Amino acid sequence: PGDQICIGYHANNSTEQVDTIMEKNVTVTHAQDILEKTHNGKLCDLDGVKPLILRDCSVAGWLLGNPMCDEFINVPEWSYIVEKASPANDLCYPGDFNNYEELKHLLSRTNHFEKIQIIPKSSWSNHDASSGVSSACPYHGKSSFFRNVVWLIKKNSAYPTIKRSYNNTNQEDLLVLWGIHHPNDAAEQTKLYQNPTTYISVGTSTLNQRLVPEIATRPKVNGQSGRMEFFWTILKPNDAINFESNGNFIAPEYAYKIVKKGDSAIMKSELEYGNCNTKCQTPMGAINSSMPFHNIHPLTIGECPKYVKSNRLVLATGLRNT
Amino acid sequence: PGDQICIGYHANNSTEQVDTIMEKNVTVTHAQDILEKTHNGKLCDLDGVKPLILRDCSVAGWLLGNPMCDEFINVPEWSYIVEKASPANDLCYPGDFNNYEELKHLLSRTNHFEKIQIIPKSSWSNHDASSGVSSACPYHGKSSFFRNVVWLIKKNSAYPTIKRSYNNTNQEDLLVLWGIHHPNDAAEQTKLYQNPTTYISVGTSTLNQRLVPEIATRPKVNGQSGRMEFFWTILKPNDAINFESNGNFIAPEYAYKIVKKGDSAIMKSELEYGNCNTKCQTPMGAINSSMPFHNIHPLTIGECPKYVKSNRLVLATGLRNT
Amino acid sequence: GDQICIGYHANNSTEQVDTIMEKNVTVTHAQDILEKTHNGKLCDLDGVKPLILRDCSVAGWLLGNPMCDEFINVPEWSYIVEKASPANDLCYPGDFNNYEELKHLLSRTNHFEKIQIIPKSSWSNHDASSGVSSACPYHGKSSFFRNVVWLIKKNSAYPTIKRSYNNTNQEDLLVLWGIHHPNDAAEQTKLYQNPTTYISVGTSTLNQRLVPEIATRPKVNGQSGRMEFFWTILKPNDAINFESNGNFIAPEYAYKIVKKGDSAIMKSELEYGNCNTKCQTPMGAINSSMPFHNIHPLTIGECPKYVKSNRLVLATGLRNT
Amino acid sequence: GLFGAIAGFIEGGWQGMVDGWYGYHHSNEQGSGYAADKESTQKAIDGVTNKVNSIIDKMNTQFEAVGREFNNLERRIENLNKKMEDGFLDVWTYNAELLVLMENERTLDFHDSNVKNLYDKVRLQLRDNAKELGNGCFEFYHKCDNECMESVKNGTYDYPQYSEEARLNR
Amino acid sequence: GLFGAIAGFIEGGWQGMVDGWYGYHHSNEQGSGYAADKESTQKAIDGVTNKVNSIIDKMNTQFEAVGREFNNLERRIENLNKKMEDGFLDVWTYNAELLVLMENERTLDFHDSNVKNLYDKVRLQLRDNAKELGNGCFEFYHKCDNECMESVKNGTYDYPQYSEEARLNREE
Amino acid sequence: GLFGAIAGFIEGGWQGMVDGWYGYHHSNEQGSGYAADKESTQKAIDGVTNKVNSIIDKMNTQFEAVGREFNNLERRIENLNKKMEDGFLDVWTYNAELLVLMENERTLDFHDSNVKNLYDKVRLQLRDNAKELGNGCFEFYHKCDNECMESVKNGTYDYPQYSEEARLNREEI
Ligand SMILES: *[C@@H]1O[C@H](CO)[C@@H](O)[C@H](O)[C@H]1NC(C)=O
Numbered sequence A, B: 001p002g003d004q005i006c007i008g009y010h011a012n013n014s015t016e017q018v019d020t021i022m023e024k025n026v027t028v029t030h031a032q033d034i035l036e037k038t039h040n041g042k043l044c045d046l047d048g049v050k051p052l053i054l055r056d057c058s059v060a061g062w063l064l065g066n067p068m069c070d071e072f073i074n075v076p077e078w079s080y081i082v083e084k085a086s087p088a089n090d091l092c093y094p095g096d097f098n099n100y101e102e103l104k105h106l107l108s109r110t111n112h113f114e115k116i117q118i119i120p121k122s123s124w125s126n127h128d129a130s131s132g133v134s135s136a137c138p139y140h141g142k143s144s145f146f147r148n149v150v151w152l153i154k155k156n157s158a159y160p161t162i163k164r165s166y167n168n169t170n171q172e173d174l175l176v177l178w179g180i181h182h183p184n185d186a187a188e189q190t191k192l193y194q195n196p197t198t199y200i201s202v203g204t205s206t207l208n209q210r211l212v213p214e215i216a217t218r219p220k221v222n223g224q225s226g227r228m229e230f231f232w233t234i235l236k237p238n239d240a241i242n243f244e245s246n247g248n249f250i251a252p253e254y255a256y257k258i259v260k261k262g263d264s265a266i267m268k269s270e271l272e273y274g275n276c277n278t279k280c281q282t283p284m285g286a287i288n289s290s291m292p293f294h295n296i297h298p299l300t301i302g303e304c305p306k307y308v309k310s311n312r313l314v315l316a317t318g319l320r321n322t
Numbered sequence C: 001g002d003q004i005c006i007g008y009h010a011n012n013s014t015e016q017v018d019t020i021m022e023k024n025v026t027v028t029h030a031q032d033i034l035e036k037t038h039n040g041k042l043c044d045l046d047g048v049k050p051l052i053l054r055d056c057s058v059a060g061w062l063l064g065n066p067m068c069d070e071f072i073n074v075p076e077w078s079y080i081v082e083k084a085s086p087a088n089d090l091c092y093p094g095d096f097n098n099y100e101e102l103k104h105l106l107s108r109t110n111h112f113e114k115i116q117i118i119p120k121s122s123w124s125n126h127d128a129s130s131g132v133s134s135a136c137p138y139h140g141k142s143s144f145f146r147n148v149v150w151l152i153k154k155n156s157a158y159p160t161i162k163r164s165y166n167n168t169n170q171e172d173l174l175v176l177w178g179i180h181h182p183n184d185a186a187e188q189t190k191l192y193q194n195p196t197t198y199i200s201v202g203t204s205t206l207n208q209r210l211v212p213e214i215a216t217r218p219k220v221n222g223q224s225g226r227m228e229f230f231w232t233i234l235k236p237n238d239a240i241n242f243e244s245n246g247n248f249i250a251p252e253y254a255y256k257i258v259k260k261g262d263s264a265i266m267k268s269e270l271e272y273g274n275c276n277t278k279c280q281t282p283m284g285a286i287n288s289s290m291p292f293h294n295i296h297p298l299t300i301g302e303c304p305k306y307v308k309s310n311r312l313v314l315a316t317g318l319r320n321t
Numbered sequence D: 001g002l003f004g005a006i007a008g009f010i011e012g013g014w015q016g017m018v019d020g021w022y023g024y025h026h027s028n029e030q031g032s033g034y035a036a037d038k039e040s041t042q043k044a045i046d047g048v049t050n051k052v053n054s055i056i057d058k059m060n061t062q063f064e065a066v067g068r069e070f071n072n073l074e075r076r077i078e079n080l081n082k083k084m085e086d087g088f089l090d091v092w093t094y095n096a097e098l099l100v101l102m103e104n105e106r107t108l109d110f111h112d113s114n115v116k117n118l119y120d121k122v123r124l125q126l127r128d129n130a131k132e133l134g135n136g137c138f139e140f141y142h143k144c145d146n147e148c149m150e151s152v153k154n155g156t157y158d159y160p161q162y163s164e165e166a167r168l169n170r
Numbered sequence E: 001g002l003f004g005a006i007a008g009f010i011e012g013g014w015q016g017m018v019d020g021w022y023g024y025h026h027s028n029e030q031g032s033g034y035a036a037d038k039e040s041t042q043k044a045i046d047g048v049t050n051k052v053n054s055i056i057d058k059m060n061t062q063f064e065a066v067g068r069e070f071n072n073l074e075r076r077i078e079n080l081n082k083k084m085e086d087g088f089l090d091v092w093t094y095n096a097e098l099l100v101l102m103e104n105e106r107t108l109d110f111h112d113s114n115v116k117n118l119y120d121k122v123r124l125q126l127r128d129n130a131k132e133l134g135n136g137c138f139e140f141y142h143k144c145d146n147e148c149m150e151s152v153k154n155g156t157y158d159y160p161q162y163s164e165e166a167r168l169n170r171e172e
Numbered sequence F: 001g002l003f004g005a006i007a008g009f010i011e012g013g014w015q016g017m018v019d020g021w022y023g024y025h026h027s028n029e030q031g032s033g034y035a036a037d038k039e040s041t042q043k044a045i046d047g048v049t050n051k052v053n054s055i056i057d058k059m060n061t062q063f064e065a066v067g068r069e070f071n072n073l074e075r076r077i078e079n080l081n082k083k084m085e086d087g088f089l090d091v092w093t094y095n096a097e098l099l100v101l102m103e104n105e106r107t108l109d110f111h112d113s114n115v116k117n118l119y120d121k122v123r124l125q126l127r128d129n130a131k132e133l134g135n136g137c138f139e140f141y142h143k144c145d146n147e148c149m150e151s152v153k154n155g156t157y158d159y160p161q162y163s164e165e166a167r168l169n170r171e172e173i
């Protein structure tokens, strides 16, 4: 006569908590954390492709060939590029890199740079190629210079007009670099290039420039009172570049085949290579997670969870615990 | 003894489906679609006002007067402007247009250009205003040039200094265009202009420029190693433009009165005129809809529904169906 | 006989909220969360007074327009107030190079202190006294910018200028200079003797050359000539080098950046309201407890969050009877 | 559903009620038939209509993409322009999709609640003068004519009227 | 509303109950009187308070517009700047207006639900010891003094204690 | 809760019922025990799984920040870049956090609603044949064997076939 059926619900030992609009820290029977909060603190390979870690070199230092940056004289295909906040080795000889940030961006659209010789250094018959060095650009305690460009000096009190051409007879776009030397005074202009009134003219199918050296005394930087200014162009397959100059010309020697284009990045990180592999990389370390969210760093590359700024994101799946 | 009343709800033969956060594809009894997924595939007038379709010409081709753009010699009021991704008829004589993107943006805030003559071709009595033509700009097999600008040559082996000015006494802002020619060598400089060292100077009450040609050795583009650089300014009512030059000057002949400013756009599309009317236009076609949303294309003009990336947007009005 | 009834509150209130499904619902208790009220005044921010430029523009102030002497020496500010179109800007007509970029730097500054970097009397080979214009009058007398010097040839000659200033101070330095653009070749020789001039400026990071651009131009403020002004930030221990054979508008005074911080350039026609606030808009100050306001998007200080709506009311009670 | 009425204790809907969303079905001596509850249906129409309008109105201040052009030395700002415009497109696509989803569920629950409230309106009106079958129907403990059946649809049903007949039957 | 209690089977609110949001009116031998239910009123105050603070907290980290200027050859980026700023402005306006709307409907229903729950708490305590009027009121089949009324409000009403007395009075 | 069942008219949950989220406790002449209602439990698991998935799917197109670099002459644009990226980052942070808060509330109500529906499912299936105890339990006015117990758990109960002995006991009790 005391037969009964009761209706009830699950309860358990769970301590996991969630929030609602109206109540905080509600204990529930089941819950799903959807936020990843950890990383391995290391710069890894991205799907089996090693990044380019420039260490103490900046991009300019790498591309122009600062003699301190000999590690990167020939670089293999990369997945991403890592640069420090303040690289030590930039323009050893002081000056300016024209449109540097635009080149940085193009570089983030690239995976591989194949270096090729376009104007051999032994090819300068009527100009001194070998004595264009500086204490501002030391190598092994000895005066040197950027490896990829040539600082031509007068030969036997003569600097004849240079007329050189190069045809891009390759199948890829070619990054070409050159520069100009701005001397400190009229006396340094004579001693280096003989002619007092000089120029550099550069022409491609899309480029037209005529540079005149700016002779002026500027504060010493790495011992140097003069400056150098660098320029770059993308030369398309079958287009030619023509140089003409009677002084102050920093000629190219090596250029870069853009052999592979794709989704790359310049990461700003003080970290170094971590000998690991990952599918998701941040500037702070790599992520290995099935979570839909993370709060490590906003700037990621690869197949990543979606970045959020919360400390906690826990979804209720079960019910209010007893 | 068996009298009855029952509480019940509607059911019908509707197969319209909605989604919820917990259940997808719920068959509902009344629904409302709020997304337009359809367009007519044509370019039309906006409220009776015809667009300017540039066909195979570009904005620069139109405004400079490329010989191959005579269809746009005098253009009526437009609603929007349509341009192809790669118009064939641009700068017939190779070179660049200075601040081209800013000019296009100003164009997108305009509906009506009226072309007026400011410096008659006949007024050049000490310069050659007839032989400034090129095989880079052919028309019916004859060497020509841009229609709105005059390429001035030396006459009787002489190029006297030019001093010309124009006061804008019209009620409207004036778009004034001019250029400079960069030859490929010092020989070409003398043959065209006589004077070895040249300039073009231009001054309004706000503008101050002095241009100097930059000689370099360049590949041929449309058969020409030379280059032309074009410039522009807005001439305010009651302001004057003063030109001075001793060579390399590409002088204005015609300018444009900005007679109507308003909402406009430079639409990028490979389509052409469809002989229709609409209130809402996309680069893919026109929309005729009472709907609040569409997913056709983000870049619209006129009274349009709001754009979303969705495939289906269906709102439940009725209840769950049996 | 005995009874118990269950029911709810009701009151006299007429306050109203909206739902998705019903507008204008009367409730017993509601909470407004939106400020619509400002005081219409430009006040101090946490007791720090703003810099109110009156009829002077930022350019007028920094260059030393003869009509802006009220601002030759300026104390620490909270924020800066500039009119939409000030009368006292570039008295001698021309341009301020990178002006907008300079204003942005100012919005990250609270304190400028003026110092002399090149004394006006140090120009022995150059006329430093006759570079004055009717375009920049003081009383009704021909004058010029105060912080910058217009050098003219001396004894029919203009020898090459070579100067160097070392920033021995602990603070960054705002350095200003200029170039004059004459109207014709004849004026060049008249003012500077040399036909082909240049100005070279150098720091350890800045490397620029200026060349005059001669052109025929309409009169602005009675002048067909133009002046273009340039600036740079000189870091502590860095030096600046000037080199010129003409057209140079030399610095005399520069600005020590003594305090960097959060600031703004506020566009407002209003003037000082002798008040103090925690939150300031270009239309007035906000004194509020609310989390939202709709006064103006551009604010400074501890402010509620700007929203465009005209009403925001949260229901707290229930449906009234 | 949340209120356990639609496809709950009332297993299905009626094809025979073309009159509205919610209503009644009566069986007595005079005959049988369907009828929609006028007041109940009209309130639910007003609510849904308002919801649809609130949804559209709130979206009238959406982001409008404008085409911009850049040269090939302006690739950084071009990229920034693209990312920002796509950003707002994505944000508003999310807002629209989520709002529709969430309010669909509320619309379904809203109808469920209206049926539940209609059933309770009848139950509290009839008290013990009728039997609760547990399927949405009420069997009367007295004979209720068509005039009596309209009094329950109208709300004004007299309980101290049929108190006698129903009392002695149980 | 959604739960059928407020403006439903209880047709109106009580002007005479100033003590709280929900409560009771009881009339026995010792006179009538309004009284608030403290357990459910405090629960509602706590809920509503938390909701308000939650809305304000979600909006403390929200877009702040900064003034930037441009020259006449920088129209594209000036147009971009303006469009960027107005865009976040509109997005945050939308979020705030929509949050307020959605929560207001929920606050209303929350109250409705509390009222019904309070009513059911009494109904499930009393069972057949009282008659269910059908308008939120219960007629006692026995005599219920002030201390008995308090056990109803306390949630400690002793059903077995009064069931026999209720059974007999009812059967008449 | 919104539906008055979980921590409501049913005071606490059962540590003894590990078979699912909602269910029954029976007690008769042949022993007592716990059994979960598989149907309503599965109905709830599917709803929750789908809710989790649609939350994840709706964030699939959220803002992805790209690092850009600017020089000392591009401070306005560098500042524009930072405020816009942080802008989308704050927006999506709000969307994620607010959606989880709102749905967490709706989930707890969902479970509450389901317990209340299951309770009502039995309630109307028993009619007066049994007695509402007011705590989630029904006391039968008749003998209810294990197959009678699994009759209401299966959802297929005979009200008329039991109304005989039930009415007899109820009239006397
Ligand atoms: C919620 O509980 C946590 C314990 O993890 C505590 O840190 C936090 O302060 C609590 N928050 C509130 C609002 O009580």
Ligand SMILES: *[C@@H]1O[C@H](CO)[C@@H](O)[C@H](O)[C@H]1NC(C)=O
Residues within 6 Å of the ligand: B024, B025
């Ligand atoms: C919903 O069913 C429809 C059938 O038209 C189909 O479009 C959709 O993919 C189905 N979705 C799911 C989630 O079952």
Ligand SMILES: *[C@@H]1O[C@H](CO)[C@@H](O)[C@H](O)[C@H]1NC(C)=O
Residues within 6 Å of the ligand: C023, C024
């Ligand atoms: C709400 O009531 C106000 C009273 O001030 C009125 O102005 C407004 O039109 C009403 N809105 C609607 C949607 O009825």
